[PDB]
Amino acid sequence: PRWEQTHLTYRIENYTPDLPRADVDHAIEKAFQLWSNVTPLTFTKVSEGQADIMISFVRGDHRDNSPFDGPGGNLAHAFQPGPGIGGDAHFDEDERWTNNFREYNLHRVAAHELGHSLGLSHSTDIGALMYPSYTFSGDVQLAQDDIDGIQAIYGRS
Ligand SMILES: COc1ccc(S(=O)(=O)N(Cc2cccnc2)[C@@H](C(=O)NO)C(C)C)cc1
Ligand SMILES: [Ca+2]
Ligand SMILES: [Zn+2]
Ligand SMILES: [Zn+2]
C-alpha cells in the first residue's frame, strides 16, 4: 500500500536522554526536507491527535516479535504503512546515538526508516542509503535511484 494523501504528519513520543530534543528534532526535520525537497509531498509535526508516522525509542524487549539482542542484530526497524501500529518506527536506544560522522548517525538511520514508510524497498546500489546492512559511507544525500524511485511513484517536484 502507499499514502494517497499529499501531506503527512509525524510526532515523536519522547526524546532519548542521549541527546537533547532540539538536536534530534533538527535531524528528523532535516530528513523530511530532503524527501520534500525532491517531491511535492509536505510534512508537519503535530503535538496532539494521532500522527500518520509515530516515532519512539525502545529498549530490549518492548512487546514486539523482534526483540533486540544486545548491540548486535538490527539497529532499528519499522512497520509497513498501515493503520494502527502500521507506519510506526522504532529506534534502538541500547546503542549511543550521535549527531555527526561518529560511530553511529541518527539522522542517517532516520532517513532510511522514512524510506521504508514511503514504500521504498532495499536497493543493491552502494550509493543508495537503503543499504541492507549498516555501513559507513560519506555524506548523507539522496541517490538518483532513490530520487527517480520516489518521483516515479508520485512525480517530479
Ligand atoms: C542506515 O540504514 C540502515 C538502517 C537500519 C539498519 S539495521 O541493521 O537495523 N537492519 C539491517 C539488517 C541487519 C542485520 C541483518 N539483516 C539486515 C534493518 C534495516 O535494513 N533497516 O533499514 C532491518 C533488519 C529491519 C541498517 C542500515
Ligand atoms: Ca542492535
Ligand atoms: Zn521496536
Ligand atoms: Zn532497511
PDB file of C-alpha atoms and ligand atoms in Angstrom:
ATOM      1  CA  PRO A   1       0.000   0.000   0.000  1.00  0.00           C
ATOM      2  CA  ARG A   2       1.010   3.681  -0.254  1.00  0.00           C
ATOM      3  CA  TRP A   3      -0.134   7.036   1.164  1.00  0.00           C
ATOM      4  CA  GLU A   4      -2.761   8.564  -1.149  1.00  0.00           C
ATOM      5  CA  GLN A   5      -2.524  11.889   0.723  1.00  0.00           C
ATOM      6  CA  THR A   6      -0.020  14.544  -0.452  1.00  0.00           C
ATOM      7  CA  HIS A   7       0.597  15.755   3.122  1.00  0.00           C
ATOM      8  CA  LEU A   8       1.789  13.625   6.070  1.00  0.00           C
ATOM      9  CA  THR A   9       2.189  14.343   9.801  1.00  0.00           C
ATOM     10  CA  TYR A  10       4.623  12.823  12.321  1.00  0.00           C
ATOM     11  CA  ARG A  11       5.167  13.045  16.088  1.00  0.00           C
ATOM     12  CA  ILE A  12       7.970  11.991  18.441  1.00  0.00           C
ATOM     13  CA  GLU A  13       6.647  10.125  21.504  1.00  0.00           C
ATOM     14  CA  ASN A  14       9.688  11.064  23.613  1.00  0.00           C
ATOM     15  CA  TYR A  15      13.339  12.126  23.192  1.00  0.00           C
ATOM     16  CA  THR A  16      16.175   9.819  24.310  1.00  0.00           C
ATOM     17  CA  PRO A  17      18.378  11.243  27.163  1.00  0.00           C
ATOM     18  CA  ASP A  18      21.429  10.508  24.979  1.00  0.00           C
ATOM     19  CA  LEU A  19      20.847  13.745  23.018  1.00  0.00           C
ATOM     20  CA  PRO A  20      18.522  16.788  23.562  1.00  0.00           C
ATOM     21  CA  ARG A  21      15.328  17.303  21.538  1.00  0.00           C
ATOM     22  CA  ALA A  22      16.498  20.390  19.613  1.00  0.00           C
ATOM     23  CA  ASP A  23      19.324  18.323  18.085  1.00  0.00           C
ATOM     24  CA  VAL A  24      17.050  15.311  17.465  1.00  0.00           C
ATOM     25  CA  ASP A  25      14.238  17.458  16.005  1.00  0.00           C
ATOM     26  CA  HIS A  26      16.719  19.008  13.579  1.00  0.00           C
ATOM     27  CA  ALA A  27      17.848  15.549  12.438  1.00  0.00           C
ATOM     28  CA  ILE A  28      14.240  14.377  11.961  1.00  0.00           C
ATOM     29  CA  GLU A  29      13.142  17.652  10.359  1.00  0.00           C
ATOM     30  CA  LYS A  30      16.190  17.644   8.036  1.00  0.00           C
ATOM     31  CA  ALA A  31      15.335  14.148   6.743  1.00  0.00           C
ATOM     32  CA  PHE A  32      11.779  15.195   5.839  1.00  0.00           C
ATOM     33  CA  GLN A  33      13.152  18.243   3.994  1.00  0.00           C
ATOM     34  CA  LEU A  34      15.461  16.036   1.894  1.00  0.00           C
ATOM     35  CA  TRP A  35      12.439  13.995   0.765  1.00  0.00           C
ATOM     36  CA  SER A  36      10.186  17.065   0.343  1.00  0.00           C
ATOM     37  CA  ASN A  37      12.962  18.992  -1.477  1.00  0.00           C
ATOM     38  CA  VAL A  38      12.630  16.483  -4.366  1.00  0.00           C
ATOM     39  CA  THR A  39       8.899  15.604  -4.010  1.00  0.00           C
ATOM     40  CA  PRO A  40       5.743  17.855  -3.800  1.00  0.00           C
ATOM     41  CA  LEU A  41       4.968  15.981  -0.555  1.00  0.00           C
ATOM     42  CA  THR A  42       4.767  18.060   2.657  1.00  0.00           C
ATOM     43  CA  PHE A  43       5.333  17.099   6.310  1.00  0.00           C
ATOM     44  CA  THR A  44       4.169  18.750   9.552  1.00  0.00           C
ATOM     45  CA  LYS A  45       4.828  17.989  13.236  1.00  0.00           C
ATOM     46  CA  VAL A  46       1.703  17.619  15.440  1.00  0.00           C
ATOM     47  CA  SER A  47       1.723  17.944  19.261  1.00  0.00           C
ATOM     48  CA  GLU A  48      -1.796  16.479  19.603  1.00  0.00           C
ATOM     49  CA  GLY A  49      -4.019  13.898  17.879  1.00  0.00           C
ATOM     50  CA  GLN A  50      -2.680  10.786  16.122  1.00  0.00           C
ATOM     51  CA  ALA A  51       0.093  11.253  13.541  1.00  0.00           C
ATOM     52  CA  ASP A  52       0.472   9.253  10.307  1.00  0.00           C
ATOM     53  CA  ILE A  53       4.053   8.346  11.309  1.00  0.00           C
ATOM     54  CA  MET A  54       4.818   7.731  15.001  1.00  0.00           C
ATOM     55  CA  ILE A  55       8.473   7.766  16.150  1.00  0.00           C
ATOM     56  CA  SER A  56       9.501   6.304  19.521  1.00  0.00           C
ATOM     57  CA  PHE A  57      12.615   4.781  21.127  1.00  0.00           C
ATOM     58  CA  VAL A  58      12.557   1.310  22.783  1.00  0.00           C
ATOM     59  CA  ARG A  59      15.000  -0.965  24.678  1.00  0.00           C
ATOM     60  CA  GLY A  60      15.418  -4.747  24.992  1.00  0.00           C
ATOM     61  CA  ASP A  61      12.020  -6.448  24.673  1.00  0.00           C
ATOM     62  CA  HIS A  62       9.214  -3.891  24.163  1.00  0.00           C
ATOM     63  CA  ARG A  63       6.134  -6.050  23.461  1.00  0.00           C
ATOM     64  CA  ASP A  64       7.311  -6.971  19.943  1.00  0.00           C
ATOM     65  CA  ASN A  65       8.023 -10.177  17.999  1.00  0.00           C
ATOM     66  CA  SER A  66      11.543  -8.919  17.181  1.00  0.00           C
ATOM     67  CA  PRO A  67      13.330  -8.109  20.484  1.00  0.00           C
ATOM     68  CA  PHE A  68      16.826  -6.592  20.213  1.00  0.00           C
ATOM     69  CA  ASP A  69      19.694  -8.960  21.126  1.00  0.00           C
ATOM     70  CA  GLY A  70      22.376  -6.649  22.557  1.00  0.00           C
ATOM     71  CA  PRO A  71      24.288  -4.155  20.354  1.00  0.00           C
ATOM     72  CA  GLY A  72      24.230  -6.787  17.585  1.00  0.00           C
ATOM     73  CA  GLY A  73      21.251  -7.634  15.355  1.00  0.00           C
ATOM     74  CA  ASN A  74      19.107  -4.927  13.721  1.00  0.00           C
ATOM     75  CA  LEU A  75      19.768  -1.325  14.827  1.00  0.00           C
ATOM     76  CA  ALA A  76      16.200  -0.208  14.053  1.00  0.00           C
ATOM     77  CA  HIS A  77      13.014  -1.267  12.250  1.00  0.00           C
ATOM     78  CA  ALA A  78       9.506  -0.087  11.357  1.00  0.00           C
ATOM     79  CA  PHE A  79       6.053  -1.403  10.417  1.00  0.00           C
ATOM     80  CA  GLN A  80       4.672  -1.392   6.856  1.00  0.00           C
ATOM     81  CA  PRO A  81       2.464   1.666   6.020  1.00  0.00           C
ATOM     82  CA  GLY A  82      -0.880   0.641   7.568  1.00  0.00           C
ATOM     83  CA  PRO A  83      -3.462   1.718  10.204  1.00  0.00           C
ATOM     84  CA  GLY A  84      -2.897   1.034  13.930  1.00  0.00           C
ATOM     85  CA  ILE A  85       0.806   0.339  14.583  1.00  0.00           C
ATOM     86  CA  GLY A  86       1.455   0.471  10.818  1.00  0.00           C
ATOM     87  CA  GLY A  87       3.708   3.431   9.931  1.00  0.00           C
ATOM     88  CA  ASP A  88       5.251   3.382  13.425  1.00  0.00           C
ATOM     89  CA  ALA A  89       9.071   3.446  13.565  1.00  0.00           C
ATOM     90  CA  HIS A  90      11.180   2.112  16.454  1.00  0.00           C
ATOM     91  CA  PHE A  91      14.814   3.119  17.084  1.00  0.00           C
ATOM     92  CA  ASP A  92      17.303   1.008  19.076  1.00  0.00           C
ATOM     93  CA  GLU A  93      18.177   3.030  22.201  1.00  0.00           C
ATOM     94  CA  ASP A  94      20.598   0.389  23.541  1.00  0.00           C
ATOM     95  CA  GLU A  95      23.303   1.968  21.354  1.00  0.00           C
ATOM     96  CA  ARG A  96      24.601   5.549  21.702  1.00  0.00           C
ATOM     97  CA  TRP A  97      23.302   7.936  19.026  1.00  0.00           C
ATOM     98  CA  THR A  98      25.500  10.821  17.798  1.00  0.00           C
ATOM     99  CA  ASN A  99      24.861  13.879  15.591  1.00  0.00           C
ATOM    100  CA  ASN A 100      27.975  13.573  13.411  1.00  0.00           C
ATOM    101  CA  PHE A 101      30.212  11.115  11.499  1.00  0.00           C
ATOM    102  CA  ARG A 102      30.848   9.374  14.864  1.00  0.00           C
ATOM    103  CA  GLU A 103      30.388   5.632  15.355  1.00  0.00           C
ATOM    104  CA  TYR A 104      26.639   5.788  14.559  1.00  0.00           C
ATOM    105  CA  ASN A 105      24.453   8.504  12.977  1.00  0.00           C
ATOM    106  CA  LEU A 106      20.799   9.061  13.952  1.00  0.00           C
ATOM    107  CA  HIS A 107      19.843  11.295  11.002  1.00  0.00           C
ATOM    108  CA  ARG A 108      21.153   8.627   8.628  1.00  0.00           C
ATOM    109  CA  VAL A 109      19.046   5.844  10.209  1.00  0.00           C
ATOM    110  CA  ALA A 110      16.101   8.261  10.343  1.00  0.00           C
ATOM    111  CA  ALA A 111      16.436   8.796   6.570  1.00  0.00           C
ATOM    112  CA  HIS A 112      16.412   5.016   5.990  1.00  0.00           C
ATOM    113  CA  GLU A 113      13.422   4.297   8.272  1.00  0.00           C
ATOM    114  CA  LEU A 114      11.466   7.026   6.467  1.00  0.00           C
ATOM    115  CA  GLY A 115      12.266   5.344   3.127  1.00  0.00           C
ATOM    116  CA  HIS A 116      10.542   2.177   4.405  1.00  0.00           C
ATOM    117  CA  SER A 117       7.466   4.214   5.404  1.00  0.00           C
ATOM    118  CA  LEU A 118       7.456   5.696   1.886  1.00  0.00           C
ATOM    119  CA  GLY A 119       7.214   2.160   0.463  1.00  0.00           C
ATOM    120  CA  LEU A 120      10.803   2.177  -0.842  1.00  0.00           C
ATOM    121  CA  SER A 121      12.387  -1.293  -0.903  1.00  0.00           C
ATOM    122  CA  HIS A 122      16.086  -2.022  -0.295  1.00  0.00           C
ATOM    123  CA  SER A 123      18.495  -1.474  -3.221  1.00  0.00           C
ATOM    124  CA  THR A 124      21.839  -3.031  -4.251  1.00  0.00           C
ATOM    125  CA  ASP A 125      23.439   0.316  -5.160  1.00  0.00           C
ATOM    126  CA  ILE A 126      26.412   1.251  -2.944  1.00  0.00           C
ATOM    127  CA  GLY A 127      25.436   4.946  -3.111  1.00  0.00           C
ATOM    128  CA  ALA A 128      21.868   4.057  -2.034  1.00  0.00           C
ATOM    129  CA  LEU A 129      21.120   4.909   1.599  1.00  0.00           C
ATOM    130  CA  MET A 130      18.726   1.954   1.660  1.00  0.00           C
ATOM    131  CA  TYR A 131      21.801  -0.256   2.220  1.00  0.00           C
ATOM    132  CA  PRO A 132      20.774  -3.769   3.501  1.00  0.00           C
ATOM    133  CA  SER A 133      23.281  -3.684   6.412  1.00  0.00           C
ATOM    134  CA  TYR A 134      24.695  -0.753   8.416  1.00  0.00           C
ATOM    135  CA  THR A 135      27.714   0.643   6.537  1.00  0.00           C
ATOM    136  CA  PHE A 136      29.636   3.882   6.887  1.00  0.00           C
ATOM    137  CA  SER A 137      29.597   5.940   3.652  1.00  0.00           C
ATOM    138  CA  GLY A 138      30.460   9.636   3.247  1.00  0.00           C
ATOM    139  CA  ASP A 139      27.942  12.497   3.088  1.00  0.00           C
ATOM    140  CA  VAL A 140      24.217  11.909   3.680  1.00  0.00           C
ATOM    141  CA  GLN A 141      22.471  12.674   0.368  1.00  0.00           C
ATOM    142  CA  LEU A 142      19.688  11.038  -1.659  1.00  0.00           C
ATOM    143  CA  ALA A 143      20.859   8.872  -4.564  1.00  0.00           C
ATOM    144  CA  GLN A 144      19.458   9.181  -8.097  1.00  0.00           C
ATOM    145  CA  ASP A 145      17.967   5.688  -7.744  1.00  0.00           C
ATOM    146  CA  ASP A 146      16.034   6.924  -4.686  1.00  0.00           C
ATOM    147  CA  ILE A 147      15.036  10.235  -6.310  1.00  0.00           C
ATOM    148  CA  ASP A 148      13.872   8.570  -9.544  1.00  0.00           C
ATOM    149  CA  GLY A 149      12.056   5.892  -7.494  1.00  0.00           C
ATOM    150  CA  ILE A 150      10.103   8.231  -5.166  1.00  0.00           C
ATOM    151  CA  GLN A 151       9.482  10.650  -8.065  1.00  0.00           C
ATOM    152  CA  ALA A 152       8.232   7.802 -10.280  1.00  0.00           C
ATOM    153  CA  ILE A 153       5.682   6.842  -7.604  1.00  0.00           C
ATOM    154  CA  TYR A 154       4.341  10.410  -7.278  1.00  0.00           C
ATOM    155  CA  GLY A 155       6.089  12.616  -9.858  1.00  0.00           C
ATOM    156  CA  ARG A 156       8.717  15.371 -10.196  1.00  0.00           C
ATOM    157  CA  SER A 157       8.637  18.498  -7.998  1.00  0.00           C
TER     158      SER A 157
HETATM  159  C1  LIG B   1      21.332   3.385   7.510  1.00  0.00           C
HETATM  160  O1  LIG B   1      20.327   2.455   7.127  1.00  0.00           O
HETATM  161  C2  LIG B   1      20.175   1.322   7.943  1.00  0.00           C
HETATM  162  C3  LIG B   1      19.149   1.251   8.891  1.00  0.00           C
HETATM  163  C4  LIG B   1      18.998   0.130   9.695  1.00  0.00           C
HETATM  164  C5  LIG B   1      19.852  -0.947   9.571  1.00  0.00           C
HETATM  165  S1  LIG B   1      19.549  -2.434  10.520  1.00  0.00           S
HETATM  166  O2  LIG B   1      20.780  -3.090  10.827  1.00  0.00           O
HETATM  167  O3  LIG B   1      18.605  -2.164  11.560  1.00  0.00           O
HETATM  168  N1  LIG B   1      18.692  -3.637   9.532  1.00  0.00           N
HETATM  169  C6  LIG B   1      19.556  -4.340   8.532  1.00  0.00           C
HETATM  170  C7  LIG B   1      19.953  -5.793   8.762  1.00  0.00           C
HETATM  171  C8  LIG B   1      20.726  -6.160   9.862  1.00  0.00           C
HETATM  172  C9  LIG B   1      21.074  -7.493  10.047  1.00  0.00           C
HETATM  173  C10 LIG B   1      20.636  -8.429   9.121  1.00  0.00           C
HETATM  174  N2  LIG B   1      19.899  -8.117   8.063  1.00  0.00           N
HETATM  175  C11 LIG B   1      19.573  -6.824   7.900  1.00  0.00           C
HETATM  176  C12 LIG B   1      17.266  -3.304   9.250  1.00  0.00           C
HETATM  177  C13 LIG B   1      17.195  -2.322   8.077  1.00  0.00           C
HETATM  178  O4  LIG B   1      17.502  -2.614   6.917  1.00  0.00           O
HETATM  179  N3  LIG B   1      16.766  -1.111   8.384  1.00  0.00           N
HETATM  180  O5  LIG B   1      16.662  -0.153   7.399  1.00  0.00           O
HETATM  181  C14 LIG B   1      16.173  -4.401   9.155  1.00  0.00           C
HETATM  182  C15 LIG B   1      16.648  -5.785   9.580  1.00  0.00           C
HETATM  183  C16 LIG B   1      14.926  -4.081   9.976  1.00  0.00           C
HETATM  184  C17 LIG B   1      20.883  -0.893   8.645  1.00  0.00           C
HETATM  185  C18 LIG B   1      21.043   0.231   7.836  1.00  0.00           C
HETATM  186 CA    CA B   2      21.465  -3.562  17.997  1.00  0.00          CA
HETATM  187 ZN    ZN B   3      10.620  -1.970  18.221  1.00  0.00          ZN
HETATM  188 ZN    ZN B   4      16.060  -1.263   5.746  1.00  0.00          ZN
END
